[PDB]
Design a protein around this ligand. Structure first.
Ligand SMILES: *[C@@H]1O[C@H](CO)[C@@H](O[C@@H]2O[C@H](CO)[C@@H](O)[C@H](O)[C@H]2NC(C)=O)[C@H](O)[C@H]1NC(C)=O
Ligand SMILES: *[C@@H]1O[C@H](CO)[C@@H](O)[C@H](O)[C@H]1NC(C)=O
Length: 273
């Protein structure tokens, strides 16, 4: 088994502008986003390859949970703004929470909030208790620990519930997170009126993202003139390209080299002028 992480991020705005939802939420499994929810549509929706997955989660019921989460999250923001007596201002509250496993063993967990970009409050499950960083967080802490069970629930979420949700999602995400999709490659050239010829090597449709893409000139690795990559979440695939400029009088042989974890051995794709 390897490393898997479940991460949630909540964003609330005290005074949202037109077309921007007051509350937004998203969730990721490793490097991919699997769902989103906002206060406009009010519905938890799977994303990317999880749109094709059935039975992993009941989105209609998750929509109800997120609405409940939303209500408490925004009330927290509302209380902070009230404490500073600045409702006329535009403020933001962001919350991050989740856990991770490695070798089927819980290896991490976190739960922290940020107010206007500054650390606000975080849960330390070893105590177990919330740790305030902002003066208003002292009030929030008081409310979140009003009854003995509250901290017990928080500790249980990070230590029992979250990792159980991750293990469950992992059972339906094998063909997504554990894929070893080999890259397709395409070498292309372009001549700019007045500029040198440029050779572009593109590796696409691969996963995981880690990859080695480079050009060679007469068996000599070259220094790229332009480089880049991207991850398409809808697809769960990456693309990575490298570009080199070639002297107008150069005749040497140019070939692209691609090495990836999914390949038995590296691939070579010479360019035929
Ligand atoms: C996964 O999604 C990406 C992004 O939509 C696809 O890339 C596009 O593919 C079409 C058709 O091949 C091209 O016309 C576009 O130019 C590509 N988008 C760009 C600019 O990267 C990709 O083909 C998809 N791969 C799979 C396996 O479905
Ligand atoms: C860990 O993986 C084993 C099988 O490899 C599985 O039976 C178990 O439910 C998983 N998590 C734990 C420790 O319960």
């Amino acid at each position: 088994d390897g490393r898997y992480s479940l991460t949630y991020i909540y964003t609330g705005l005290s005074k949202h502008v037109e077309d921007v939802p007051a509350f937004q939420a998203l969730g990721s499994l490793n490097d991919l986003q699997f769902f989103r929810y906002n206060s406009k549509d009010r519905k938890s929706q799977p994303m990317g390859l999880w749109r094709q997955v059935e039975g992993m989660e009941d989105w209609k019921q998750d929509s109800q949970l997120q609405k409940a989460r939303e209500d408490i999250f925004m009330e927290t923001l509302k209380d902070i703004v009230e404490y500073y007596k600045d409702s006329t201002g535009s403020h933001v509250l962001q919350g991050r929470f989740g856990c991770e496993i490695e070798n089927n063993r819980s290896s991490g967990a976190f739960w922290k909030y940020y107010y206007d970009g500054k650390d606000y409050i975080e849960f330390n499950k070893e105590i177990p208790a919330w740790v305030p960083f902002d003066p208003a967080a002292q009030i929030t802490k008081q409310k979140w620990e009003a009854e003995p069970v509250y901290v017990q629930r928080a500790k249980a979420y990070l230590e029992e519930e979250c990792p159980a949700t991750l293990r469950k999602y992992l059972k339906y995400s094998k063909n997504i997170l554990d894929r070893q999709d080999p890259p397709s490659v395409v070498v292309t050239s372009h001549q700019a009126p007045g500029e040198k010829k440029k050779l572009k090597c593109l590796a696409y449709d691969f996963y995981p993202g880690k990859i080695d893409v480079h050009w060679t000139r007469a068996g000599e690795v070259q220094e790229p003139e332009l480089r880049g990559d991207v991850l398409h979440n809808g697809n769960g695939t990456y693309q990575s390209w490298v570009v080199v400029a070639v002297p107008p009088q150069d005749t040497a042989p140019y070939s692209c080299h691609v090495q990836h974890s999914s390949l038995a051995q590296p691939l070579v794709v010479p360019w035929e002028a």
